[PDB]
Design a protein around this ligand. Structure first.
Ligand SMILES: *[C@@H]1O[C@H](CO)[C@@H](O[C@@H]2O[C@H](CO)[C@@H](O)[C@H](O)[C@H]2NC(C)=O)[C@H](O)[C@H]1NC(C)=O
Ligand SMILES: *[C@@H]1O[C@H](CO)[C@@H](O[C@@H]2O[C@H](CO)[C@@H](O)[C@H](O)[C@H]2NC(C)=O)[C@H](O)[C@H]1NC(C)=O
Ligand SMILES: *[C@@H]1O[C@H](CO)[C@@H](O)[C@H](O)[C@H]1NC(C)=O
Ligand SMILES: *[C@@H]1O[C@H](CO)[C@@H](O)[C@H](O)[C@H]1NC(C)=O
Ligand SMILES: *[C@@H]1O[C@H](CO)[C@@H](O)[C@H](O)[C@H]1NC(C)=O
Ligand SMILES: *[C@@H]1O[C@H](CO)[C@@H](O)[C@H](O)[C@H]1NC(C)=O
Ligand SMILES: *[C@@H]1O[C@H](CO)[C@@H](O)[C@H](O)[C@H]1NC(C)=O
Ligand SMILES: *[C@@H]1O[C@H](CO)[C@@H](O)[C@H](O)[C@H]1NC(C)=O
Ligand SMILES: *[C@@H]1O[C@H](CO)[C@@H](O)[C@H](O)[C@H]1NC(C)=O
Lengths: 370, 346, 214, 50, 198
């Protein structure tokens, strides 16, 4: 730690000691049903973008690796998460929105985008934490005579707020002359239809879009991943996986006053202090494993190679594993130097009126004194 | 605001004013000497036993050795400050059991063996007025590891690598140094600040002090009872002033509060996101792949390093100010306790 | 109708999330009812149009010692096109619809204990907010004009209705008295005690003293 | 700018530290002027004869 | 027609607070110190002000420096004329040369140039496409403008922290000089000093 081969007399702070974890536990709820992504992904027909569907996926285990066998897309477009880590973490509610758009407008299914689809048809929030899946469909959504079952909205008095629908079909009035049903030169019906034909370019093909919106942990968790659970162990340094929250620490029974709706506890530095087990409803404190600071008291390298080691801030009935003499000091206990009843001037300072030195006894050794 | 009361000296070129009586007065000056010695671990603060953050922090640079060197230099500097101010006598003197120092009491500044810590009554008041926080290793890693229904800031800063080192000299040794200085000053005068201690009766020493300030020594010997009573009443007045008013020690209390709020701000800066998707490394490493979590962890590493460097720079400036005050206190102990000073208002 | 006006002193404080915090002064920015706001007292007696607007939040508070208020029908146009919450105190069901039949097609239907579990005046405070296509109902049953003191409101129930709300109307079924106040986006400073309850709060827009406190 | 202000509140708490440091500096300058000049308890005046 | 630097720094949030004591109050403090010094001597710094003629006070000062007091009373006119000519020479040297106050003028120049470079740091790009936030808002979507705004925020925060650190170091130096000035006022105006070249 000094980047040198010779060490002068003094006390040096080298590193910190840590109690390494021994076991690993995983705690997931008791959920056995399978999520119906299949019912979402192949259907006889989808809906228009102004009347987009929404399916609630809840109380099931979700496998996201069977998505690739249902539709011939290229890759996920995930915001906030990554598609390869979707099996290692658990949500509370997953929604699925299904609609068909043109290939020009797939780029408007991103957060923070404006245009025509993202203004009057389907608007995403800027805090989006989901994945957008879009694939070409020219063999099911197009006809040689023209497929006119898909509609979209051009005219609307205001912009759509995120995650809301407008299935109203009323005649727009952009002019100053009221019509109330007459589609004149100033009143138009704001639902035009795509003229989908198979003999188009690649930018005008229909594209089936499925948008998965994830809801993070603010509740008891319902839509988890396919991972087995482990028996709960307490009073030991382990690794825990409580509902996708990963950390290292010890677990103790708590005497806290958690309300029924609350599930987590947080500290001043916004780290998790207490957690509620998902299988049995009990509260467990999360205390980090035992640590501290290690200081090395040595004389010069030219003098000798004897070393005393000080563990800062602990009473050492708590060291997991230098010399064999143990002396307790207010600055943590000192191992490797015996305590003599004399008193000399301070050679190497330790703290709280205790110093150390390399002196004889009658056979040279490191001694500690006041 | 009012600058002061209006006055006009009745000046004339054949008129003088000469006092006919005096007043012995005891004042009080409070000077900071040292401050809290802190020790900061980088890996527990910035990363907190995450292997990926530790690898990126090793890949980042070598700023943490510089921060550790600066904080170690500050701690050794405060130990040097306390040793410079208090350790000025080579022998621990002792007072005689008879306490008749010419009618002067000296009973509230000399130690008494009733308390386990041999401190005087005014020293007990001065240690009672300052509400000390982070006094050293008082938690000792046993209360933090247990279950407390209301966690304090000390455990939250201990779990993030922010510790407090104890001072080298305990308060018993500081009280012993001040007791030795008081015994040498009472029984010797200024002769123990030059060579060996020379005993002298306290009345004759006080006559030497009056000869020092420019007054003939017959004034003291003909008014010894009045001077002793005035000194006792001044000691009683500063007794009642230290007992009643709690705003006198607002320099030392400000030092303690400054160190506490600096450590509290350093703890509270861990909850900031610094542009990343979350402020915790575990959710970033669990919700993302390697490539994107590298960018988010890099943003958090840069933010926490900037916060730690800001803390270290402010600590360096505060240590320079405290060292200047400690040099002033050492000069005052050398020139006013070990002798008589002719400097005006020093 | 008998429209009246009174003062809501300190009520309307609810838990902003579902995270346990103890001995922590937390600062939150959400849609709260402002301190010392001017709320409306309604002495509606039928022997009277309850078609109130919504405006981003409802404080709804009734000092009824009995259970004579059924529920609240939300929405924009309520002329048997799309209705809303049809809560009944029959202790069997809370039915939510996106359809007709305002009073005598099934959306999310919910079964639990009745809201009015108890029989002093026993003020009932509710919070109805609607942001990001999601709707929350906070409630706290305070046993006893509006009283003095900070009483926190728990998220007793949640509801995924996902519909637009512009108006608000209370359904009775003789003499009734209920308060309606409006929520605004404001910054608060809540005080959690050692048991995790919010016993006091500071509004950061009332007077310069509270702004200094924040 | 609303977006920059939202990102700055999202950033951290550096600015309260900067404001606290500048306020301490200004109070220190006022204390400097007070402890240099205000050393006399009364405002004396010279006689008209000079 | 030509904007000064004060408006350009006031429009960007950099203000200057006034001092607590006005210049009239400092002049009153110095006039009270002068009146006490020339009508009482050093006695107004210990207790009450005790009047004494100025010849007897100067005899006290010569007895302080080690010269017997009969030197002044036999050479009073010569000493008074030498003092008056010295005061006239100080007046002439202050009227001719303006380079004596180059500590106070450097303090003013240092603060002015620090605020001026803090203003001039707002025209830098810091790796972004523009130094104007409004062009970044109007020219880009949300996602890219967030990146450019983050870069500008980091650069401006670094510049402002550098300014604050330099101000703290200058304030420590100024406080040391103020402590020296307070010691000089306490020891040399309120009494006679035995320290060599103080
Ligand atoms: C000088 O001052 C002291 C007090 O500062 C005077 O002592 C007081 O004298 C009165 C009158 O006899 C007593 O009632 C007080 O009890 C005395 N006080 C103390 C503390 O002894 C003293 O008389 C003054 N001397 C002259 C000559 O004026
Ligand atoms: C020195 O001062 C102390 C402190 O006031 C005196 O102790 C007091 O003595 C009186 C009478 O004996 C008691 O009524 C008080 O309770 C004592 N105070 C304390 C704090 O113990 C002491 O008497 C003085 N010395 C002399 C010689 O009189
Ligand atoms: C919930 O999980 C526990 C785990 O031990 C299990 O015993 C219990 O049967 C589960 N409940 C249901 C309804 O499956
Ligand atoms: C969808 O379901 C049908 C019948 O359930 C099945 O034949 C078909 O292969 C599935 N997939 C697609 C892409 O149509
Ligand atoms: C450390 O542990 C021992 C034994 O459990 C205990 O007696 C002691 O008080 C503890 N603390 C210190 C500071 O030694
Ligand atoms: C509320 O407003 C009404 C009129 O808008 C007014 O008469 C009444 O006094 C107000 N109540 C207050 C300020 O408490
Ligand atoms: C059921 O509700 C839908 C709208 O959600 C409406 O179109 C339909 O007409 C309703 N059914 C009947 C029988 O009215
Ligand atoms: C709800 O409907 C109204 C129609 O009065 C409309 O103006 C508004 O945009 C809709 N959406 C809201 C309030 O989110
Ligand atoms: C917390 O709850 C306990 C248990 O009833 C009670 O004794 C204590 O007073 C409560 N604390 C506060 C601050 O109300």
């Amino acid at each position: 730690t000094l980047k040198s081969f010779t060490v002068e007399k003094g006390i040096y702070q080298t590193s910190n000691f840590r109690v390494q974890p021994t076991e690993s536990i995983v705690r997931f709820p008791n959920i056995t049903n399978l999520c119906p992504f299949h019912e979402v992904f192949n259907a006889t027909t989808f809906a228009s973008v102004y009347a987009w569907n929404r399916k609630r996926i809840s109380n099931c285990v979700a496998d996201y690796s069977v998505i690739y066998n249902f539709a011939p897309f290229f890759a996920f477009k995930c915001y906030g998460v990554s598609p390869t880590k979707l099996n290692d973490l658990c949500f509370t509610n997953v929604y699925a929105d299904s609609f068909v758009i043109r290939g020009n407008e797939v780029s408007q299914i991103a957060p923070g985008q404006t245009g025509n689809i993202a203004d009057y048809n389907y608007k995403l929030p800027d805090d989006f934490t989901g994945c957008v899946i879009a694939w070409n469909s020219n063999k099911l959504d197009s006809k040689p005579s023209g497929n006119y079952n898909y509609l979209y909205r051009l005219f609307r008095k205001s912009k759509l707020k995120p995650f809301e629908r407008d299935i109203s079909t009323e005649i727009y009035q952009a002019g100053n002359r009221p019509c109330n049903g007459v589609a004149g030169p100033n009143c138009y019906s704001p639902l035009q239809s795509y003229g989908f034909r198979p003999t188009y370019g690649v930018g005008h093909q229909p594209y089936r879009v499925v948008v998965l919106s994830f809801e993070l942990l603010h509740a008891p968790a319902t839509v988890c991943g396919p991972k087995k659970s482990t028996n709960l162990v307490k009073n030991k340094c382990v690794n825990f996986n409580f509902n996708g929250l990963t950390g290292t620490g010890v677990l103790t029974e708590s005497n806290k006053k958690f309300l029924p709706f609350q599930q987590f506890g947080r500290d001043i530095a916004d780290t998790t202090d207490a957690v509620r087990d998902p299988q049995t409803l009990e509260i467990l404190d999360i205390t980090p494993c035992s640590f501290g600071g290690v200081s090395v008291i040595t004389p010069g390298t030219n003098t000798s190679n004897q070393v005393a080691v000080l563990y800062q801030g602990v009473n050492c009935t708590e060291v997991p594993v230098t010399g064999s003499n143990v002396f307790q000091t207010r600055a943590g206990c000192l191992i490797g130097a015996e305590y003599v009843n004399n008193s000399y001037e301070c050679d190497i300072p330790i703290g709280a009126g205790i110093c150390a030195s390399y002196q004889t006894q009658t056979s040279q050794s490191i001694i500690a004194y006041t | 605001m009012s600058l002061g009361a209006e006055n006009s000296v009745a000046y004339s070129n054949n008129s003088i004013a000469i006092p006919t009586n005096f007043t012995i007065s005891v004042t009080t000056e409070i000077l900071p000497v040292s401050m809290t010695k802190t020790s900061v671990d980088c890996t527990m603060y910035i990363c907190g036993d995450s292997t990926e953050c530790s690898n990126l922090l090793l890949q980042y640079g070598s700023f943490c050795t510089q921060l550790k060197r600066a904080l170690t230099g500050i701690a050794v500097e405060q130990d040097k400050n306390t040793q410079e101010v208090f350790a000025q006598v080579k022998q621990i003197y002792k007072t005689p059991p008879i306490k008749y120092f010419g009618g002067f009491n000296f009973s509230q500044i000399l130690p008494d063996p009733s308390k386990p810590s041999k401190r005087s009554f005014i020293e007990d008041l001065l240690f009672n007025k300052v509400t000390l926080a982070d006094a050293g290793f008082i938690k000792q890693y046993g209360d933090c590891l247990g279950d407390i229904a209301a966690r304090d800031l000390i455990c939250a800063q201990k779990f993030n690598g922010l510790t407090v080192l104890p001072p080298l000299l305990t308060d018993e040794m500081i009280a012993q140094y001040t007791s030795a200085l008081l015994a040498g000053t009472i029984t010797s005068g200024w002769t123990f600040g030059a060579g060996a201690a020379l005993q002298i009766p306290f009345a004759m020493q006080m006559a030497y002090r009056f000869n020092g300030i420019g007054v003939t020594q017959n004034v003291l010997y003909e008014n010894q009872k009045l001077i002793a009573n005035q000194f006792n009443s001044a000691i009683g007045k500063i007794q009642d002033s230290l007992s009643s008013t709690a705003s006198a020690l607002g320099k030392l209390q400000d030092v303690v509060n400054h160190n506490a709020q600096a450590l509290n701000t350093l703890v509270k800066q861990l909850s900031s996101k610094f542009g990343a998707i979350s402020s915790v490394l575990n959710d970033i490493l669990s919700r993302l792949d390697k490539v994107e979590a590298e960018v988010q962890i890099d943003r958090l590493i840069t933010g926490r390093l900037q916060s730690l460097q800001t803390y270290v720079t402010q600590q360096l400036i505060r240590a320079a100010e405290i060292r200047a005050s400690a040099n002033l206190a050492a000069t005052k102990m050398s020139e006013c306790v070990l002798g008589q000073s002719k400097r005006v208002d020093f | 109708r008998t429209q009246s006006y009174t003062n809501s002193f300190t009520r309307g404080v609810y838990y902003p999330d579902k995270v346990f915090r103890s001995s922590v002064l937390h600062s939150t920015q959400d849609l709260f009812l402002p301190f010392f706001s001017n709320v409306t007292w309604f002495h509606a007696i039928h022997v009277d149009n309850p078609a109130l607007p919504f405006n981003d939040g409802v404080y709804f508070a009734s000092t009824e010692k009995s259970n004579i208020i059924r529920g609240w029908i939300f929405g924009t146009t309520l002329d048997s096109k799309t209705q809303s919450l049809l809560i009944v105190n029959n202790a069997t069901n809370v039915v939510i619809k996106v359809c007709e039949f305002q009073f005598c097609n099934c959306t999310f239907e919910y079964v639990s204990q009745p809201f009015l579990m108890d029989l002093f005046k026993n003020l009932r405070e509710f919070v109805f907010k609607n942001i990001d296509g999601y709707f929350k109902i906070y409630s706290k049953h305070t046993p006893i004009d509006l009283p003095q003191g900070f009483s926190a409101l728990e998220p007793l129930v949640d509801l995924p209705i996902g519909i637009n709300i512009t108006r608000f109307q209370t359904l009775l079924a003789g003499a009734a008295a209920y308060y309606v106040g409006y929520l605004q986006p404001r910054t608060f400073l809540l005080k959690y005690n050692e048991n995790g309850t919010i016993t006091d709060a500071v509004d950061c827009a009332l007077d310069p003293l509270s702004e200094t406190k924040c």
